[PDB]
Structures are given as C-alpha cells and as structure tokens.
Symmetry: D2
C-alpha cells in the first residue's frame, strides 16, 4: 500500500479549491540537516511538502497558482540534473522528468527561484505561505515580495495578503483517505511484528538497546527503513521516564520493560507501546498496576467512535485509574473527591490520545482540552499509562514501575478499527508468548 | 575499550598548555536537530565538544580558563536538574554531579550563561572560540564580548584577541592515543563483522536496504547503536554512484553490490567498503575490474608507513590502475603518457585516503594534494575504486560496474596496522564465504 | 496650521472602517538612528506612524483592534515614565497621559510588548502588519504569532491572515484633507521665503553651502526646524548632477546655481527648485535653456487639473523641450521623429512630477507610466529641467548648464493651486530681485 | 586648518607598525542611513575610517596588509565610476583616481569585495577587524574567512587570530597631532562665535529653536556644515534636562537658557555650553548658583595639566559645589561628611570631563573612575553644572534652575590651552555683552 501520483494531484486540487482566485500557494521542502561536520542525517522530507508531492529531495518548492476560479496550474522548483553532483551524491529527478513523474505542469531549476518566483507572484492578490516554517523559505519569499513592492516602475505589484496555509492543510491531513488508512494499517502491522519480536527476543542480561536493534531490523525487513520517532526501551526505573531513549542499561531479571516504538512506512507513523516482564512473568505488584492500565485501554477501545471525544473517553480512564489506585492503597480517599482533585496526575501525567499520520504527533486541531467531536477518518493513539516513581510515597512494592500500553486506531462509521491489535497485550497472552519463546 | 574521564582531562590540560596566559577557551555542545515537526533526530554531540568531555547533552558549554602560566581551571555550563523535564525527556547530569562525573572544577546552569560568561571573560587578553561553528554559540559569545566592551563604567574589559581553536584541536585529534586506537580497533572489528554478515546474507531478490538492515543490526548488537555515516548499498549501476544511499532497488542475479558502511563506537568511526557478487560468483568482466582495485589496495597496504604520504601512495595506485585499464582495453595508449594526462580520472575520481576518527572524514591538515608526511598515530582509510558508467565508451562487458574496496589503518612505527582485515576481500575468499553461506 | 488630535483619531477610524471584523492593525514607530558612536541623528518619526498619532517618540506601537463591525478600540505601547532616563535624555509621555493627549483608549509600557501583544492578537482572524518595514517590528510580530501558533494547550490561536496595510494607508495619504493642504500651503510659503532669501544673498565667491545656511536658517525661523531632504546647491557643472549635495564649491561669476530645497513643517514636505545666475544676470545661452524649462513649467501649471495625468502633461512638456532644443541646434531633425525617439532623454532624464506629503517623494500609486487620472486632493510637484553635460556634443555655449524649476501644487475641483508661486521664476523677475538685493 | 593626505598616510603607517607580520587590518566605511522612506540623512563617515582616509563615501573598505616586518601595502575597495549613478546622486572617486588622491597603493571596486577579500587574507596569520561594528562588515569578513577555512582543496588557509583594532586605534586617537589640535582650535573658535551670537540674539519671546537656528547658521558660514551633536537649548525648567533637544518652548523673561552646542569641522567636534539669562540680567538666585558652577570651571582650568587626572580635579569641584550649596542652604550639614556621602549628586549627576575629537564623546581609555594620568596631546571638556529640579526640597528661589558651563581644552607640556575662552562666561561679561546687543 502506498500513496500514488494521482492522490498527490487530488490533494493539490483540493487545496486549490480552497484558495482565493488570484493567488499562489508556496510549499517548501525540508533542508538537509548536519549530523556531524560534513556528514548529514538521512533525509526526511517536510510532511506538508511530502503530502502534496511524494517527492523526497531538498531544494524543492511547489507553487500552486490559482489564476481565477477555473484556471490553475502548478510549478515545481527542484534541483537540476548535474552529472558530477549525481555521480557523487545520488540521482536527481531534474526538470525534464518532473512533470510526468510528479504530475505537475511545469518544472524549473531551484537555482533560478529568485529570478522566477517574483514573476509568478506578480499581480496576485494573495500568497499562501507558512511563515516561520523554514528560515531559507522565508528569505526566498520575503525577497520576492520586496522585489515586487519596490518594482512599480517595472509595473510589478506584490500580493498584499499572506495567509498561513497550515491550518487548511492540517485539517486536510486530519481526515485520512482510504489509501492513507491502508498505509497506516500496514505501518501498524509492521510495528506490531517488531513489538512481538522484541517480546520473543527479550532475556535478562540483554541491554535495552538490543531490543531497539531487533525492532529496527524488523521495520527494515518490511521496507520501513526508518523509525517514526526515537525508540524508547525503558526497563525498571527507566520505564518511569516518558521518552527515555538512552536505552543503555542491562535489563534485570524481575523488572518490566516498556517499549515505545513505531515505524515510518511511506511517510506514515506507526506508534505502539507494550510493557512486559523482562523474565517473562509479571510479579503480583506488576500485574496489579498492569491490569489498571489494560482496563483503561480496553475500555477506551470499546468507547472510541464518532460523536465522542478524547476528553470524554479520558474521563472514563481517569475513573478506572483512581478506582484501581484506591483499591491498591496507592491513593487514599473517596474516588469522586480524588477524581475532582485530579489525584491520578502524579501517576498518569500525559494525554490519552494524539492524532497519528505523517507525523507521530500528527497535525490537526484538538479543541479545548481535546474536546473536539470525533468523526470517521480520524486516526489516533490510545495510550494510558501509570508511572510509580522509585521514591513515591506508596506501598513499597509498586515503586519504580512504569507501564504504558498503546494502540493506534482509526475512527470508522460504526466505532473504530484497531490497527495494532496483532501484538498481544493481555498479561496471560504476553506470558504465554514469552514462555514459548524462552523454551526455544 | 572506551575513553575515560582521566583522558578527557588530559586533553583539556593539553589544550590549556597551548593557550596563552590570561585566556579562556569556549567549547560548545551541538544543538538538538529537528527531524519532523516536534520529533528530533537522535542526538549527536559535536566531535570537538565530545573530545574534551565525553558528555552527551545539548545546552552545554566547556570553559577552560588559563589565568596565568601555572593557574587554570574549568567551568561547565549544562542543563539544570528539573524533575518535570526529566520525567518527560530523560535524566540530566545537572550541576551537583558534574564536577566529579566529568572532572571539571565547577558547573553552572546553562540558563545563567549570559549572566556569567562575561564575568569569566572580563579582563582576559585572549578568547579561543570557533567562530561560525554554531549560530547559538556565536550569539552567546558576541553578547558577552559586547557587554564587556560597553562596560568600562563597570570596570569591565573584553579580550581584544579571538583565536579559532579548531586548528590546534584538530591537530590534536589527528594523532590518536593508544586508548583511541583501541576504540578504533573495536569499531573496525564491529564494522568488519557487519560486512561479513552482509556477504553471508545477500541473495538475488533481496532489496539493497535489506543488507543495510543486517549491517545496522550487527552494529547494534556490539553496542554501536548508530552508523558513523549513512549506509551505501549500491548494486549494479547504483555502485557507480559514490554515496548512493537510496538503497531502494532489488538486487539482481549477475550484478555486483558495493557496500560502504561503518559503525560509530564510543564516538569513533569505522569505515569499510566491500564489493561482491550478489549471486556469490564474480563474472569474468567483474573479476577483471576487481583485481585492479584489489591490487591497488594491497599495494597501498604494503606501502603505508611513516615517512611516505597519501600523495606518494596515490601515485603508485594511479600506475596500477592505468596499467590494468590499458590491458583490458578500457584506456588506450602509452601508460606513462596516460598517467601524465590523468587518464584514470573518469574511472577513479576521488581520493585514495582520508583521516578517520571522531568523524568519518576526520579533521586534520592534509597538506597540498595530501602531501603531508605520515607519522605514527595517524589513522586513515585506503579506498581505491573503479566506476565504469553504463554509457562509458569502453568494451561493453565493463559498463555499469562500480567497485570500491576500503580498509581502515593506523600508521605505526614500523608501517601500518590494518583494523578491518577480518572481513575478506580476496575474490576467491569472498566466493568461498558466499558459497558456504548459500549452502545453508 | 497643524494636524490636531481629532484628525489623527479620524484617520485611525477611517483605517478601522476598512479593516475586517476580528482584526488588529499594528503600526510601529521609527527606530532611533546612530550618527556616530554614541550620538544619534535628530529623531524622525515614521511617516505612517506619525500619520495616525502625531507622536514623536521611538519605542512606540499603535494597535487598532476591530473586535467586530461595531466595537473597536486602540492600544498604544510607549516608553514608561522614568525619572533618570528623562533627566538625561528628555521627557516621555508615559502611560498615564497618553490616552488623553493622543486620544487612544489605553496605553501600556513598551517594555511589556512581548508579554501583551500576543494576548491582543489571540483569537483574531487577521493581522495588518507592514512586514519588512523594520527588523525590530518583524521580530516582535513574529514572536507574538509564534507564541499563539504554539499555544493551543493554553487555548491560544494566531490570526492566519496577515495583510500589508501600506497600500490602504498610502491611498489615504494620497488624498489630503483641507487641514493637510493648509499645512502644505504653509510649508510652501516657508520654503518659498527661503528660496527668495537665497537669491537675495547669493554673490560670486560665496560657497554653495552658504546658500544652504541661509535656507536652513529661514526654515528654522518659521518653525520648520529640519529640511524635508538634503539641500542641493549645484552651481556651474554641479547643476548637471541631479541630487548634488556636497555643496562644497565656490560659486563663480558667470555660472548658474540650481537650488533644490524644502522644509519639513509639521511632518509635511515643501519642495522647491529655482535656478538663477550667481551674478544676477543670465547669459544669452543660459536664458535660452531657461526659457524652455520655464515654458515647460508654465504650460504644466495651466494644464494640471482633475481628469488629466502626469503622463499626459509630460507629453506636452516633451514636445516643448524637443521643439526648443531643435531651435537652438542641440537636437537635430524632425520634431515628431525626435519625440518618437525620446531624443530629449539625454537632457531631461527624470519625471516631471512626484506626489508630495509626509514624504517628499510621497506614497501613493502612480499607475503605469504615471498614467493615473488626477483627482482633487492630490498634491504633486512640477519640476521640468534640462541638463547639458560639460562634454555634450552640442553647441559649446550650452555645455555645463543645469536648470530645474519646480513648484508644488494641489489638484482642486477647478484645476490646481500653486503653493510655491511666491518665489519668482520669470527670468526678468529673478534679475530684478537680484539687482535690487545687489544694490544694498 | 585641515588634515592632509600625508597625515592620513602617517596614521596608516603607525597602525602597520603596531601590527604583527603576516596580517591585514580591515577598516569599513559607515553605511548610509535612512531618514524616511527613500530619503537619507546627510552622510557621516565612520570616525575610525575617516581617521585613516579622509574619504567621505559609503561602500568603502581600507585594507592594510603587513606581509612581513619590512613589506606592507594598502588596498581600498570603493564604489566604481558610473555615469548614471553619478548624474543622479553625485560624483564618485572611483578606482583610477583613488591611489593618488588618498595615497593608497591599489584600489578595487566594492562590487568585487567578496571575490577579492578572501584572496588578500589567504595565508595570513592575523586579521584585525572591529567585530560587531557593522552588520554588513561582519557579513563580508565572515564570508571571506569561511571561504578560506573551507578551501583547503584550493590550498586556501584562514588567519586563525582575529584582533579588535579598536583599542589600538582609539589609543592613537586619544593623542592629537599638532595638526589635529589646530583643527580642534578652529572648531572651538567657530563654536565660540556661534555661542556669542546666540547670547547677542536672545530675547524674551523667541523660541528655544530660534537660538539653534542662529548657532547652526554661524557654524555653516565658517564651513562647519553640520553640528557635532544635536543642539540643546534648555530654557527654564528645560535646563534641568541634560540633553534636552526638543527646543520647542518660548523663552520667558526671567528664565535662564542653557545652550550646549558644537560644530563639526573637518570631522572634529567643538563642544561648548553656556548658560545665561534670557532677559540679559541674572537674578540673585540665578547668580548664586551660577557663581558655584563658574568657580568649579575656573578652578578646573587652573588645575588641568599633565600628571593630574579627571578624578583628582573632580574631587576639587565636588568640594567647591558642596561648600557653595551648604552656604545657600540647599545642602545642610558638615561639608566633609556631605562630600563623603556624595551629597552633591542630586544636583551634579554627570562627569566633569570627557575626551573630545572625531567624536564629541571621544574614544580612549579613561581608567577606573576616570583616574588615568593626563599627558600632553589629550583633548577634553570641562563641564561642571548644577541642576535644581522644579520640585527639589530646597529654598524655593532655586527650583527649576539648570546651569552648565563648558569649555574644551588641550593638555600641554605646561598645563592646558583653553580652545573656547573667546566666548564669555563671567556673569558680568555675559550681562555686558547682552546689554550692548539689547541696545541695538
Ligand atoms: Cl538547481
Ligand atoms: Cl539550565
Ligand atoms: Cl518602557
Ligand atoms: Cl562598486
Ligand atoms: Mn503515542
Ligand atoms: Mn508511543
Ligand atoms: Mn572512507
Ligand atoms: Mn567508506
Ligand atoms: Mn521634487
Ligand atoms: Mn525638488
Ligand atoms: Mn561635553
Ligand atoms: Mn556639551
């Protein structure tokens, strides 16, 4: 499953439909990024630029011109063919092949952008530009507008109105096409296979980073070369650090390990968390905390549907958590009073759900306190957790336990589809999986 | 093998020894780097900052103060302990633990750098600063100097002399300690194991990125979490692109595959290239080109020693290459005349050797045309190659062949030590290795 | 004559009337400007900021908030009262007095602008900002918008639409109120008195800068402390340099002197040019060129009216010039063919007319080739000239003659009013004036 | 009196003498400065650039190259000859004429500075640059150094050492040549004539700005076109504001007026303050305060000599002031105790003396608390004052009196020479001068 040229074209047209007549939208590629000295990190295209192109080169700009209500066209600026640059650093699409390959009307050399961009903006009423997204982009746009403003003797005029297209584009990205959902489904499957593998490989004495290695290898074998975010492998007390990425410790017999990892497949993020015993068997204390987090997730998965909200479902989770923590003596008092005091917050301090897509923390308006009403096509995570610090004033057997369990779902007409349920999460199923692996 | 606190301290002292009395050296950490939106790439410390600290956090500055010829001390600015920031994003060293952990005299919060740095520079004659290394660093230094310049009514004075410490520090980095050589030896071993694995795993129909996956997994299992540069897996015509990193193609029965990959182990780079038949058997044409590249490497390995130079050894390689290409009918004419015309350059267009260390293309002065006389402690690669383009005007059977073979060496009193000879390169040994793997 | 608080308020309201509901307009003061080291040039307020405030301090920002179609209000950010700063550098209006003094609703300290501006923009749809006008202003606005964009967890939202208010404001400035015309009339009178004085004071052997001194003293005595642009006193060959401001030469018996000077009175520019003989008597050659320039001006003054254009009147001037130059043998050929070839351009190389107001080259759209149809309330200059270079291929007696004659006019319902006719320009009147002065 | 080409050359050579062998010094011209929209303030050259060139154009850079201890040469970058630019905006020196005119070895177009500067710095050990002086200059220098740093393959090397030449150059400027003293003497005379004129012209009912007009006209007639700083005309309570420049009030019968004004003559500043009765007669209260300030000045003029300091002489002034204020009942208590409490500070809140030269507040190190020992060739002001605020808790008759009296002196072998004593300051002489003028 992938996103095709025709879908990128549909997206461009959908943006154009929303634009004022006599306008242009400017969408800039990500800059290359230094890792150390003359070496660069592996290139990651800007998500919005990718969304409209599927084009994985830097020094590229998509220009959508809406001349009036019926006439519109697209111009791509991108790197020229250059034999020497290509022998050294890789092939470039160039100008000749770009119109057919990407489905744009015209392509020009990026080297000519300052000589050409102002000519494309001349006489328009509106420019759509994500001001502040990239310094190099702001420089180019500001220079073009200045040339126009100062060019009345050459009969040039600048568009007086600049509109940030990010809100419009992010609202588009918030609602996935069936093709996007298919890509995210595959990302979920790939990510789930990696998590199953980590559970089957984990043994006391392995380092946290060893499970990262297994996970990243599994991503790669299915064609997801890169993770969508830095892998978290937090064993023991490290599980109480939310985005622990050091992954530097030897995993101890008797500790839990929390793994938060996701692949990036055709630009889209998977995002799964599983927590499990390093030695394949939950202790009683570990199981007691685990059960509360799992009940929170299972209830959320029953509830998520069009017409509810992340806020509403969070309320149900908070009650489950406070109730369970009271039962274990971690919290003390009346459940309703404790809920009113947000007494869960020392142990569950983050959100239940974030949007998921071309970014792991995907774009799109949540509403105040994540109250926005859910509709079909939205994709989100469900990630309750409980984190009991090593020095927490709680019964001693719970100290240093960090548990999160996270699935990715899509809202459907009739509820939700769980994209990541192919990796187990019921404690008896986790134990059975690990027992079977440990016998090999 | 690693670099210890005491060695980082020795390095700091060695720099101080070279500094003028009444001076301070300022060494800044790398900024964190965005991958997409709110997600960051895995952190990579600045090599020079790492060299003097072994400290892997951003928002840190090492200040070495040489008050006079006997008195000197060190101050680290680094991120404060903060419970909330740490629960979310990871532990921080903080100020209390830094002096003992890192072996610095004093530690202050990075948040106080603008309030404190000018006080440390006040009245000094010289400041050592790598101007232009980082924008955020230049801002801090320039602000401090401005406060001093403009502060005569407060009895403040700025050092009038600013010296770039990069030349001094890079000359230090050019000559490895025995401990650094031990780390590089391990990096070589790890990298060699990964390359052997790639050869043993490679089959027709696998994707180029599959070998990347095997390699990166092997790095990880030995505790080298990250590669030192983006892995190159160039099969068939892709092998003729020097830093081909797309690694997106299905590897064909009958093609060669060129793999250039290296681990980063305790900050240090391995860097190996091996080229081999995807199907385990060189064709005659492939073997003919391979033999020339291998003879070039083997001769270079015999020759490299104190008192010669990369330029001198390159001359020997150029003769081997021109001679071999003439014999195959790829070049035509008198060998000496062809050498004088640099007739090899269409097929061997890069340098034979680069320095190796905390960066894969390591720091240090090469001399004009890489003529600097070699001395013990220098570490460098040896990477001859021949690249015959698909459209080259040569006998047809050689078109589309890209071959490079690369080892990492250290110059010793008596010649050189090859750090990467534990992965095979003789064609009969490559074939035997692959035959044995293909039978499993 | 001046502009009052109530008029500044009317202007603010007129802008608000043009703004979208749910918007704010941001108008920034000019920065102070270094002359040398710690000394500054005399402060000149930004013309647009002045237009809406009559407030002559730096570090001030006018914010007009249009909450909806009936509700709007104004906030001024300006420097706080500060005893010490004021003892040293002068009084400040401060926050307490500003609402009554300026007629704004609220005033806040400029020091609080970053803490307050984002709160004023929060939830609005549109921000009107002159992007690129001042770096310090862009920094403030961009920072506020960034806080809002990144503040969804604090329920903050940024206006997505940014509109340059310069086109709207400059169209306002293009049409003068009766009060503005009264101020410009006084500027014209003051400027004319200064030019009359220069003619009456000029003698051979005086330096060009001496006439500048007389002019600037005359401006000052009528309460126009500063010129509206750098005074030009170009005698002899210097008159052929359009904006010659060196004014460093001894004025020679037998040369003409061209004086282009104007006062700045209550923010508004006068702009007069007169050219006259240094010794009080035009030579025949000088008179021959002068007559052509004067006929050009006199004809233009008869013609300028609503319904014509600067382009149309320029056409008449070009014919007068080509005809006269042909008669003197400076141009050769058929007048109509010469006009078609723009053969006047070596001798008359600038525009006939520019808008006049708070800037000498005032704001406002001219139309292609200054073709915009004139309407009552527009104020413009009329400044034909002929400049015959020292090395021009023309009859020798004309070489080194530079003549311009310039008046300021306002377009009225019935034609135009000349604001600067109280300084003579007929050659016999110039001679009579100078003869009378030279007898004293 | 002026500074000649040969003196500018001597200065360049004196700097070169102080430079390390294998170095270059870069001295940049001031940028042009916007007044409003497309109009600029009258150009003021950077004082340090002027000091080494006497060249009054922007877009110019002086490069002094010290190849070794015997060989050195100079290169000027400056604007090219351009017929069109010159017809419009004025003549340019250009490259052909610059070597002879300025006495530099070579001249190149400013447009070529980025193509040429790095070539001049290549292989040098040291660059002298005033970092942070001008943004445009920093950009040029940083770009050149970057080209060199990154150009090892082209055999380029950057100087590692950057030295701020400002301390060396400012120490040069601190000690005036006899020719500089002659120029400053003329500036003093011109400034004194202007102050005498202001006293002779002043009448009740004139505006403060009228005296500014008289002063500026007097500067101009002697060939000092511009003031060295913004003229202060502070009548009545305005005299209690130190740098009151509004000069907007009608001068009242019975008030004092304080005038602080100085010309700029050949780059050098005059700086005189005189305070006098608007109506020509000091009141008793006014005279009582005046006498203390005058005694302070007269004593300082007797004392200033080589071997004392501004700090030492200030001590004498403070005693005079405290003693006088006690006698009038403005201060109460023991004089020595009051001195120890710095009880004068509410009434005399600024320094007695600043250096004077190419800047009114001239460059040069003062020492802690202006304790530097004075030597021949130093030029400084002497400017005691007393400022009794309108609301001061003092006998009512002294409220609202602001008095300063300021002369410019040069330290000589035998004491000092007063450059500004040709304008009167004894109260009886001021009265006599004004009485005589008021009778005309
Ligand atoms: Cl390009
Ligand atoms: Cl901090
Ligand atoms: Cl303020
Ligand atoms: Cl130029
Ligand atoms: Mn998540
Ligand atoms: Mn997650
Ligand atoms: Mn290499
Ligand atoms: Mn390599
Ligand atoms: Mn004009
Ligand atoms: Mn004019
Ligand atoms: Mn002074
Ligand atoms: Mn003064």
């Amino acid at each position: 499953s992938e996103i095709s040229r025709q879908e990128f074209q549909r997206r461009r047209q959908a943006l154009v439909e929303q634009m004022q007549p006599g306008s242009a939208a400017l969408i800039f590629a990500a800059p290359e990024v230094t890792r150390s000295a003359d070496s660069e990190y592996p290139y990651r295209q800007n998500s919005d630029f990718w969304y409209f192109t599927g084009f994985n080169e830097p020094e590229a700009v998509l220009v959508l011109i809406k001349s009036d209500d019926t006439h519109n066209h697209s111009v791509l600026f991108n790197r020229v063919r250059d034999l020497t640059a290509e022998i050294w650093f890789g092939r470039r699409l160039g100008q000749d092949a770009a119109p057919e390959k990407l489905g744009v009307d015209r392509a020009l050399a990026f080297s000519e952008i300052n000589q050409q961009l102002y000519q494309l903006l001349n006489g328009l009423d509106v420019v759509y530009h994500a001001q502040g997204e990239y310094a190099y982009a702001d420089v180019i746009v500001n220079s073009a507008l200045e040339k126009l403003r100062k060019g009345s003797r050459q009969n040039l005029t600048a568009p007086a109105t600049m509109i940030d297209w990010r809100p419009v584009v992010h609202e588009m990205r918030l609602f996935k096409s069936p093709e996007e959902i298919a890509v995210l489904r595959r990302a979920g499957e790939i990510t789930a296979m990696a998590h199953t593998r980590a559970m089957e490989k984990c043994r006391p004495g392995m380092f946290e980073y060893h499970l990262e290695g297994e996970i990243h290898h599994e991503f790669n074998r299915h064609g997801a070369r890169y993770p969508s975010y830095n892998t978290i492998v937090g064993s023991g007390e490290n599980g109480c650090i939310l985005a622990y990425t050091e992954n530097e410790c030897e995993m101890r017999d008797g500790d839990l390990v929390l793994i938060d990892a996701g692949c990036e497949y055709k630009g889209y993020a998977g995002d799964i968390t599983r927590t499990f015993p390093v030695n394949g068997k939950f202790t009683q204390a570990q199981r007691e905390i685990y059960d509360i987090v799992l009940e929170s997730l299972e209830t959320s998965l029953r509830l998520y549907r069009p017409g509810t909200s992340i806020l509403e479902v969070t309320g149900e989770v908070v009650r489950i958590m406070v109730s369970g923590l009271v039962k274990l003596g971690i919290l003390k008092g009346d459940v309703d009073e404790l809920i009113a005091q947000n007494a869960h917050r020392p142990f569950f301090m983050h959100g239940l759900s974030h949007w998921l897509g071309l970014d792991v923390h995907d774009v799109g308006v949540y509403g105040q306190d994540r109250s926005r009403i859910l509709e079909p096509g939205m994709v989100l995570t469900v990630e309750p957790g409980l984190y009991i610090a090593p020095d927490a004033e709680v019964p001693e057997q719970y100290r240093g336990i960090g548990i999160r369990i996270e699935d990715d779902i899509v809202i459907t007409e009739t509820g939700n589809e769980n994209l990541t349920a192919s990796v187990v999460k019921k404690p008896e199923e986790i134990e059975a999986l690990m027992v079977a692996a440990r016998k090999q």
